[PDB]
Design an enzyme around this catalytic site. Sequence first.
Site, PDB file in Angstrom:
ATOM      1  N   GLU A   1     -10.452 -25.502  -1.495  1.00 36.21           N
ATOM      2  CA  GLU A   1      -9.447 -24.495  -1.808  1.00 36.21           C
ATOM      3  C   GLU A   1     -10.135 -23.339  -2.514  1.00 36.21           C
ATOM      4  O   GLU A   1     -10.653 -23.506  -3.621  1.00 36.21           O
ATOM      5  CB  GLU A   1      -8.342 -25.059  -2.697  1.00 36.21           C
ATOM      6  CG  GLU A   1      -7.316 -24.018  -3.107  1.00 36.21           C
ATOM      7  CD  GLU A   1      -6.275 -24.565  -4.059  1.00 36.21           C
ATOM      8  OE1 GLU A   1      -6.346 -25.766  -4.390  1.00 36.21           O
ATOM      9  OE2 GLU A   1      -5.395 -23.793  -4.491  1.00 36.21           O
TER      10      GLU A   1
ATOM     11  N   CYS B   1      -4.191 -19.184  -8.815  1.00 34.48           N
ATOM     12  CA  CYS B   1      -4.719 -18.962  -7.474  1.00 34.48           C
ATOM     13  C   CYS B   1      -3.673 -18.436  -6.501  1.00 34.48           C
ATOM     14  O   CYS B   1      -4.040 -17.834  -5.486  1.00 34.48           O
ATOM     15  CB  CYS B   1      -5.327 -20.261  -6.944  1.00 34.48           C
ATOM     16  SG  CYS B   1      -4.178 -21.655  -6.865  1.00 34.48           S
TER      17      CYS B   1
HETATM   18  N1  LIG Z   1      -8.323 -21.809  -7.362  1.00 30.22           N
HETATM   19  C1  LIG Z   1      -8.937 -20.605  -7.075  1.00 30.22           C
HETATM   20  O1  LIG Z   1      -8.539 -19.950  -6.115  1.00 30.22           O
HETATM   21  C2  LIG Z   1     -10.009 -20.224  -7.953  1.00 30.22           C
HETATM   22  C3  LIG Z   1     -10.623 -19.026  -7.776  1.00 30.22           C
HETATM   23  N2  LIG Z   1     -11.647 -18.697  -8.641  1.00 30.22           N
HETATM   24  C4  LIG Z   1     -12.712 -17.788  -8.252  1.00 30.22           C
HETATM   25  O2  LIG Z   1     -13.899 -18.281  -8.822  1.00 30.22           O
HETATM   26  C5  LIG Z   1     -14.660 -17.172  -9.260  1.00 30.22           C
HETATM   27  C6  LIG Z   1     -15.599 -17.639 -10.340  1.00 30.22           C
HETATM   28  O3  LIG Z   1     -15.022 -18.709 -10.969  1.00 30.22           O
HETATM   29  P1  LIG Z   1     -16.230 -19.997 -11.060  1.00 30.22           P
HETATM   30  O4  LIG Z   1     -15.780 -20.686 -12.286  1.00 30.22           O
HETATM   31  O5  LIG Z   1     -17.519 -19.209 -10.974  1.00 30.22           O
HETATM   32  O6  LIG Z   1     -15.969 -20.966  -9.835  1.00 30.22           O
HETATM   33  P2  LIG Z   1     -17.334 -21.830  -9.569  1.00 30.22           P
HETATM   34  O7  LIG Z   1     -17.986 -20.975  -8.541  1.00 30.22           O
HETATM   35  O8  LIG Z   1     -17.967 -22.067 -10.907  1.00 30.22           O
HETATM   36  O9  LIG Z   1     -16.926 -23.263  -8.896  1.00 30.22           O
HETATM   37  C7  LIG Z   1     -15.961 -23.761  -9.749  1.00 30.22           C
HETATM   38  C8  LIG Z   1     -16.194 -25.232  -9.936  1.00 30.22           C
HETATM   39  O10 LIG Z   1     -17.302 -25.639  -9.156  1.00 30.22           O
HETATM   40  C9  LIG Z   1     -18.230 -26.238 -10.046  1.00 30.22           C
HETATM   41  N3  LIG Z   1     -19.561 -26.026  -9.491  1.00 30.22           N
HETATM   42  C10 LIG Z   1     -20.299 -24.839  -9.440  1.00 30.22           C
HETATM   43  N4  LIG Z   1     -21.499 -24.984  -8.850  1.00 30.22           N
HETATM   44  C11 LIG Z   1     -21.537 -26.339  -8.506  1.00 30.22           C
HETATM   45  C12 LIG Z   1     -22.510 -27.120  -7.870  1.00 30.22           C
HETATM   46  N5  LIG Z   1     -23.695 -26.553  -7.462  1.00 30.22           N
HETATM   47  N6  LIG Z   1     -22.320 -28.455  -7.635  1.00 30.22           N
HETATM   48  C13 LIG Z   1     -21.115 -28.951  -8.070  1.00 30.22           C
HETATM   49  N7  LIG Z   1     -20.093 -28.339  -8.687  1.00 30.22           N
HETATM   50  C14 LIG Z   1     -20.334 -27.001  -8.898  1.00 30.22           C
HETATM   51  C15 LIG Z   1     -18.030 -25.510 -11.410  1.00 30.22           C
HETATM   52  O11 LIG Z   1     -18.550 -26.236 -12.392  1.00 30.22           O
HETATM   53  P3  LIG Z   1     -19.514 -25.208 -13.554  1.00 30.22           P
HETATM   54  O12 LIG Z   1     -18.351 -24.722 -14.359  1.00 30.22           O
HETATM   55  O13 LIG Z   1     -20.464 -26.214 -14.211  1.00 30.22           O
HETATM   56  O14 LIG Z   1     -20.104 -24.261 -12.549  1.00 30.22           O
HETATM   57  C16 LIG Z   1     -16.501 -25.456 -11.423  1.00 30.22           C
HETATM   58  O15 LIG Z   1     -16.017 -26.695 -11.814  1.00 30.22           O
HETATM   59  C17 LIG Z   1     -13.623 -16.232  -9.879  1.00 30.22           C
HETATM   60  O16 LIG Z   1     -14.132 -14.942  -9.863  1.00 30.22           O
HETATM   61  C18 LIG Z   1     -12.461 -16.384  -8.888  1.00 30.22           C
HETATM   62  O17 LIG Z   1     -12.499 -15.444  -7.866  1.00 30.22           O
HETATM   63  C19 LIG Z   1     -11.668 -19.266  -9.910  1.00 30.22           C
HETATM   64  C20 LIG Z   1     -11.089 -20.438 -10.114  1.00 30.22           C
HETATM   65  C21 LIG Z   1     -10.420 -21.138  -9.009  1.00 30.22           C
END
Ligand SMILES: NC(=O)C1=CN([C@@H]2O[C@H](COP(=O)(O)OP(=O)(O)OC[C@H]3O[C@@H](n4cnc5c(N)ncnc54)[C@H](OP(=O)(O)O)[C@@H]3O)[C@@H](O)[C@H]2O)C=CC1
EC number: 3.3.2.12
Lengths: 60, 678, 678
Positions: free
Chosen positions: C255, C294
Amino acid sequence: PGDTIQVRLTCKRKTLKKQRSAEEKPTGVVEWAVEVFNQHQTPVALYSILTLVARQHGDF
Amino acid sequence: QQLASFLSGTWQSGRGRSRLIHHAISGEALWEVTSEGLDMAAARQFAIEKGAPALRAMTFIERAAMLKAVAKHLLSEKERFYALSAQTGATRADSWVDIEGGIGTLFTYASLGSRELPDDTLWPEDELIPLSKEGGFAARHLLTSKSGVAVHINAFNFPCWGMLEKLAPTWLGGMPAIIKPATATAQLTQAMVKSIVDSGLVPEGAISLICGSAGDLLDHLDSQDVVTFTGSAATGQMLRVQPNIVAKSIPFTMEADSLNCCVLGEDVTPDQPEFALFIREVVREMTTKAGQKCTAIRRIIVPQALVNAVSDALVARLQKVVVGDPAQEGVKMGALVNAEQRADVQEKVNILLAAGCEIRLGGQADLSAAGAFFPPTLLYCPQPDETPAVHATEAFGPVATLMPAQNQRHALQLACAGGGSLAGTLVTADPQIARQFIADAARTHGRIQILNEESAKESTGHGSPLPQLVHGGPGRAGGGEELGGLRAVKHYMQRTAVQGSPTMLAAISKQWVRGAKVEEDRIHPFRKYFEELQPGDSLLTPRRTMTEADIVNFACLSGDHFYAHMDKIAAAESIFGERVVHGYFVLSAAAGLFVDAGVGPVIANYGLESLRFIEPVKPGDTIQVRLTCKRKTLKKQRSAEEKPTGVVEWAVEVFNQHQTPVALYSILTLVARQHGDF
Amino acid sequence: QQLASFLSGTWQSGRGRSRLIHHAISGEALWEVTSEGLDMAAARQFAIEKGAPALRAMTFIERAAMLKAVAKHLLSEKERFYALSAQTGATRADSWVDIEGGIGTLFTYASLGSRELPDDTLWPEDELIPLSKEGGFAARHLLTSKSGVAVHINAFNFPCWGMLEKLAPTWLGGMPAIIKPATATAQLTQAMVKSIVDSGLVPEGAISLICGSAGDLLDHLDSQDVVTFTGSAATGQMLRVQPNIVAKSIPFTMEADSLNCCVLGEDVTPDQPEFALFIREVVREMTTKAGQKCTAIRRIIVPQALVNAVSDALVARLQKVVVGDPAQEGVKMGALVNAEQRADVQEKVNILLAAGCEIRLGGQADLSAAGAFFPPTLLYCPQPDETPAVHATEAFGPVATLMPAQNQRHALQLACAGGGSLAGTLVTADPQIARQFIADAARTHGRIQILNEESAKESTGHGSPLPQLVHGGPGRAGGGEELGGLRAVKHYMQRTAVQGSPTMLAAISKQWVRGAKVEEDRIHPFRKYFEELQPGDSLLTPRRTMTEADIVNFACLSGDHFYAHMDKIAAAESIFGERVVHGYFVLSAAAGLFVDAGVGPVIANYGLESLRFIEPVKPGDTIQVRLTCKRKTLKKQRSAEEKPTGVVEWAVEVFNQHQTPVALYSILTLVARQHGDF
Ligand SMILES: NC(=O)C1=CN([C@@H]2O[C@H](COP(=O)(O)OP(=O)(O)OC[C@H]3O[C@@H](n4cnc5c(N)ncnc54)[C@H](OP(=O)(O)O)[C@@H]3O)[C@@H](O)[C@H]2O)C=CC1
Ligand SMILES: NC(=O)C1=CN([C@@H]2O[C@H](COP(=O)(O)OP(=O)(O)OC[C@H]3O[C@@H](n4cnc5c(N)ncnc54)[C@H](OP(=O)(O)O)[C@@H]3O)[C@@H](O)[C@H]2O)C=CC1
């Protein structure tokens, strides 16, 4: 009216028949003792019916 | 000799580097395939802007009648397909499966789309989900057909079936397809596509064909596209990591190779009839289509005390298997499709021989014959749990290993150790063995056949994927599911949970919901014909006072002398409080209220969808019935003599003087039509 | 201050490089997370060989009672969760959604698992699929729960909801979960997990928690594992190409974020209340949870002649929104979660300003402020189709663009130009506009709310993902669907089409099929209690000859004077041939035959599952009913005073003197239990 009816069917007397031929089904005149009653459990309409119940094993 | 690809409405062909199609039973090349230089973006562009709006304008009933018409058109000229399928090295009994199962898939999806799909473009799969207490905010799930293409990449097993088991759900779910057959036997697929196109039944652009490599098709797909794959696991894992399928997040469905178990139970002894049908099923499954079907038995798991009996039965049954040309008499097994496939089978046989054993003619196979023959092979593995190469390497031919088990707990582990399979078989007579086998081994299989004496009389077989059963297992078998009845046409649709007022969801779904606006128009809805009914045409019936005499007359007439209706003492002790009216008498007096006594368009009732008695109807409690139309969903008049009609579903809603809903249900009705079509 | 990780039953913590959790509204670091050195393979090993046989041994009814118990235990101590959630910058009304939506999702899945799931380990979702003409070979689809772990990778929006909307379908579908929360707000997730674990309600190993980077978990996953992602698109497209997920072919449900539209129709004029609820819905959606949910509205599509009115109304409504500390009074919008999120929102606003316009206070945000504040931003785009940066660059905050349309056909293209969206909205009153909107813009949206005056009274809103509606859209939104009712627990189950004889499927599914063997044991199945019923307990009722007087008395008693039953002339010209017995009288005389008149364990009927009248019943035509048990599916006795009971379903099979089945159906029945559980 507005007075329930509950029936106590119970067997009373068996008295088999002697199967006068060899082709006829073996049977016996079982008499039941029907005892109707109501919610106060007093006996309304107690009577007795005859019934020609068939036997499992014939003799002649 | 070119193999013309059907792209953008024209039978084009490639210009450049080419592959070629060998005749499998003799050895010469009588086709050659190429697709270089073909504009792949123009094919998807023509499909999306030509055949996708022509399919998405049709209703589901018309798209089922189109599949029935293509099935009747392709069943007539079926004999020009056996001549092309004999080039694959398959027999008449194998090509009969390949052709007639592929056309029976079309007939099956026609009979599913003409019975369980609406006369509409949007298909609401739920009933209704009420989200409010007052009743002004509900929601239901709409299934709208996607607006892109369905790129199908098949394999060399079933050119006829493996296309048409992906093409009938695609057309029934309103998408144009771009079928990419394998270049080993693409000529049968071109024969199928030519017989489809030269009929005027499908719209233009609603089918395409790329005989050769795709090259630049997966790099052009929009997010509203789906990809379905069937072939090796090593290629399909390279296509899943393709940097556009993961960028646009398009649904990639994969079917791969597997190691299908066939477990024999402890209850089966060689004096039972289960043993002979076990040996017959294993041999027929291993020798049908020369072992080149994806659901072939490749691991025979037997108990330890029966290994010699199973092996001496399988060898004595398999020495009668005649390998040769299919056209001459007395030959049962056909041949493999290529010499490259023969080398690819024997190089897996050598890997299984690097740690297993041998019972029959295994690696002895002539790699110099003019013909892709391979002998039937029955292997052996004395240590099944200590040899991981058996549960990881499949030989995609007549090869099937045999390995012992230990009292129905090692058998379950050896059946589940395949890394996910595609089909399975337990041959038992004790059903509590089958309960444990399904409870512990349906996590890894996709279609299990518990075979006994009653099943084997009319069994379709282990290698007959039914067009209304899920074809596809987890893990090593890909993961993606096909042929699941109407579960296959839902891969080609987007499930949209549409919210709003119920009077809005009545107009979106072209149905009636629960509390929509109604069209009461002074006459009776049972007097209207089919073409002048609209979903929402309601009727408020007169009342009927449920008296104490009604309960007694109905309990006398039916015979239902249940204590909550005829007894005053026991109903005072029950959950209701007193005697209630029969539920079936409310159901019958409702139809007494709304049914016209005259001769009208309504022909027959024959149905009742979902009855629930909410609140009890008591004596001295009136009943008022709200008949209103819900669905129309016409029938296609299968003959020329039959009366035109359509299954109108009414939504009946009984209530009382407090206006609370007692006994709301829904009846089906075969309302006649004013004007026929055929 | 360490923030622990519940792995292998023990609250472990990492030893190495550590990220740290900032306080949102003030700016200090009050937690810090790490997971270096934690053995992830041993965590998955403990969850598979300790928690999975403890969940898969439970029935579905017990796994729903467990979710209800955890929901009550987590609703009791809910006030220790608002204090942790206020650290995330959310308000009280914005954390109320986060807490109570997750706990209401738990109660909703408890109700769904109690109502529509069987008292079994397996789950037969179909009725039956007959595959033979005689009736000795059939098949039905089973759903056995997988034997792995569910790796849920959540995000920073909803720690409480976003875990619990993935945890109840996982636990109801018989799998242990390993939740990896976001390292920005893992403290509320550990509060939830600790409140779950320290109650004794769930088995050990049925839940895990890695507050920190996983690193070594995704490289150690078996093929029975599922992975669910929720976050950015760019991360989830790197996790989909992860080599173990494509090598073992495990399901990866993603998602991502999208550009959710909110289309205003041409029929709406500013004098209507539709305009007012449109402006209220856009402002409440964009200001709830600081625009970080979201499903937030990020593209307002308006008519061309209503740009000034919508813009002035949004300016006059949004300037009343106060950005500040949530605990002090007079503050509606809270803050963001991190200064990195503030920088990301401002650098997406700058990209949108590279080709857009401005209506309000936008990119002006103090990057040195003690707190992650951001003002509510309303952008503008005068050329909406000629600007591809609007339809591709999301700003994940209070930011939403505004753009005109051209008469409800350019608005459809602007709603579909987002490349797949997670949610959408049409605000109209004409229902044909809603029909044209769902017919073209439900291909890209996952959940469309058609909003009008009747819906806006008790609407849950646009940013409340319901626990019984599909949450997930195609394309940019990810493709992977969540929360679809019972469609969510089917992502955690393998769908196996189990073939075989019906007397074998009756013992596999613990039900009755169509032609299974029966157990007629000389007494009446309505006299048996619940615990002494078995599925297969049949009843061969005495016969009843249908006559003309039966038709007359039933058509008199009900009132159904339909011409195929009363009239003699028109019955000779109808499809039947002569007068036939009523279908409802066959249905009623059946219950006259099989129902015990005495006082027994059968309490109420209230049900009739699926009725089909196959052949007509004539005068002079006997009727013989075959009442046999099909399901048991006990209830959980919600109080201690209530009578223990369970919904037993009987499969009724009426036939006649030729033994051909007329009117075969199925009734639900509430049979009282012998021994309760309280
Ligand atoms: N539901 C939605 O539609 C959402 C949209 N967003 C989008 O996300 C963008 C950035 O938010 P961000 O927090 O950077 O989302 P991430 O890109 O950090 O991915 C979110 C989740 O993935 C985990 N994650 C990241 N890299 C890895 C990996 N290599 N292996 C396993 N798990 C991983 C993160 O943990 P860690 O925190 O340790 O990276 C977090 O729990 C925002 O600008 C927004 O656009 C934000 C939240 C959800
Ligand atoms: N359903 C099953 O379980 C099947 C299993 N197999 C396995 O396949 C092995 C050999 O069959 P194989 O011929 O290797 O099947 P491939 O792995 O070659 O791929 C099969 C299909 O994918 C196509 N294809 C290959 N590469 C690409 C690509 N890069 N982009 C798009 N399409 C592509 C092939 O076209 P081309 O033919 O031009 O490569 C063919 O249509 C057998 O040993 C057996 O194990 C065989 C058939 C099906």
